[PDB]
Every structure is written in C-alpha cells, then in structure tokens.
Amino acid sequence: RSDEKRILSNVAVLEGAPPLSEHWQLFNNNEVLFNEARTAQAATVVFSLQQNAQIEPLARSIHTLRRQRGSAMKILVRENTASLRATDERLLLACGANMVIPWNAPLSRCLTMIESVQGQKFSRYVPEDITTLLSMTQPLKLRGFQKWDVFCNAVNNMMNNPLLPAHGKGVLVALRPVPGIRVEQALTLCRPNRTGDIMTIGGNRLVLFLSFCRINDLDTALNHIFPLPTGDIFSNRMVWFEDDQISAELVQMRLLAPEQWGMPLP
C-alpha cells in the first residue's frame, strides 16, 4: 500500500547514526538513493550535498523525480558542508525540492525539518526541459521560440547571474512588423542557428535576445536569422544592449497581459 511514512536517505544525513525507525532506509551515495526513489511514490527522499560539483547532477535527479513521481513525494537536500549559494538554492527548489536543510542546522534540527514536510504536497510548476532551469545558474542553453514569461525569465536570470561576464552578454531587440504582416507570420521567418539566441512574440512585437552580440553587429546577426531583408519584414525596432537598459525593459515586458502573448502557428 502507501509509502508516505518511508524515509530514503543518504547515510551522511544521520552523521554516523543508524536508521532511526523501520521507515528509514540508508544509501551510501545519491546515485543509489535516486535509483530507489524512482520506485517510491509518497516517500521522503533526503539527498546529501557535500560539494558544489554535485549541484547540477543533483538538480537533474530532483527534476527527474518531481516530474516523473508527482506531487506526493517530499524531496529534501541536506547541505552537509557550507557550499550552497543563494542562486543554487533557488535552482534546487525550482527543480522540485520542497526544502533545503542548511549546513548550520544540527542533526536534531534536521530531524525536526524532515517531520515538518509530512503531508506537504508539491504545488509549484516545474518546467519539462531542465535547460530552462539550468539557465538560472549556467549560460543560456535555450534556442528559438519561448513563451513570453519563459523568455522574460531566461533574460532576467542572465542579467542577475553573478558568475556570467559583466560585459557584452548580448542584445535585446523588439521588432514591429510592417502593416501587412502579423507577428505569428514574422516568427516563422525567425530561424536562429546559435544556442543562446531566443525569441518571443506578444503585443504586436517580435522580441529577440542575441547572446554575446555587440550592438554594431546587430544587423549582421539579423541578416543571418531571417531569410529576407529585415527592412521588408519589420517597420520599427527598439534595441537594448546594456544590462540596466535590458533589466528596465524586462520590467515593462512583464506588464503585458497573457491574452496578448503569442504562440507559434501549427
């Protein structure tokens, strides 16, 4: 029947202690724990975080578990060594973890937090593609059309990522089509070939983000993405190439009603 009371945990979480009840099961590492958690349903899964190199493989495992097992499972990250940055915490929580047990919390407090998550159902939306999430902490790996909010999020995660270079992150360009063309039609002509080049449609504008592109190279970039001259497709264009200008424009973009958000044609 139900595995709601079952606790699957890496050995490191109990800091040397044996299983605390008949419900606890211990695993020598996060790989064997994850493989077991794959067959669980409503169980508590407690991964151990030792070093920063484990963040991405852990993000992938949490993501796989949340998407494939559903909302009943409680997925916890026990930070054993002081390593988790605020950005990587945001990533792990967005991938499907209910809670992170920080390093400075002793074993007794760790045990209190494990009991606190019981009966808690995961109600947050988790994106299907892990690259949508990894774009929070890693350079943009998305390409092509993205829904307005997903586009806004990816560009915003890029401006706020402290590991990225301060300069030349790319160019944000909002293109307005000529009277005879709808944005949905202009979108079918928008075919970027580079990873990091994404676009969206909304409020009668085609909005592109071109990674590592200098402002002087914008026309060159646009000539490669479109098979026809951009002057024949679009009447107007608004460009932002400085971090403050891009961030200021993402604020104005986030004000667009979902009824005004466009989607690609079938």
Author numbering: 222 to 487
Task: Recite the paper's sentences.
Purified untagged BcsE217−523 crystallized in the presence of c-di-GMP, and its structure was determined to 2.2 Å using single-wavelength anomalous dispersion (SAD) phasing on crystals grown from selenomethionine-derivatized protein. The protein packed in the P41212 space group with two BcsE217−523 molecules per asymmetric unit adopting virtually identical conformations with root mean square deviation (RMSD) of 0.835 Å over all atoms. A single c-di-GMP is found splayed in a symmetrical conformation between the two protomers, and nucleotide recognition involves four residues of each subunit, namely, R415 and D418 from the conserved I site-like motif as well as the side chain of H445 and the peptide carbonyl of S432. Unexpectedly, the construct adopts a dual-domain fold with an apparent N-proximal module connecting via an interstitial helix (α6) to a C-terminal domain, in which the last ∼40 residues (C-terminal tail) remain unresolved in the structure. A search for three-dimensional (3D) structural homologs using the fold recognition server DALI revealed that the N-proximal domain adopts a receiver (REC) domain-like (βα)5 fold, where the central five-stranded parallel β-sheet is flanked by 4 α-helices, while the canonical α1 is mostly unfolded in an extended conformation by a stretch of proline and other small uncharged amino acids. Structural and sequence alignments of BcsEREC* with phosphorylation-competent receiver domains, however, show significant deviation from the amino acid consensus of key functional motifs, indicating that the module is unlikely to function in phosphotransfer-dependent signal transduction.
Bacterial cellulose is a widespread biofilm component whose secretion in Gram-negative species requires an inner membrane, c-di-GMP-dependent synthase tandem (BcsAB), an outer membrane porin (BcsC), and various accessory subunits that regulate synthase assembly and function as well as the exopolysaccharide’s chemical composition and mechanical properties. A third cytosolic protein, BcsE, has been shown to significantly boost cellulose secretion in vivo and to present a second c-di-GMP binding module in addition to the BcsAPilZ domain. Crystallographic and solution-based data show that BcsE’s predicted GIL domain is a degenerate receiver-GGDEF domain tandem (BcsEREC*-GGDEF*), where the divergent diguanylate cyclase module binds both dimeric c-di-GMP and BcsQ through mutually independent interfaces. In addition, we reveal that a third N-terminal domain (BcsENTD) determines the protein’s homooligomerization and targeting of BcsERQ to the membrane as well as previously unreported interactions with transcription antitermination complex components. Together, the data suggest that BcsE acts on multiple levels to fine-tune bacterial cellulose secretion, from the early stages of secretion system assembly to the maintenance of a membrane-proximal pool of dimeric c-di-GMP for processive synthase activation.
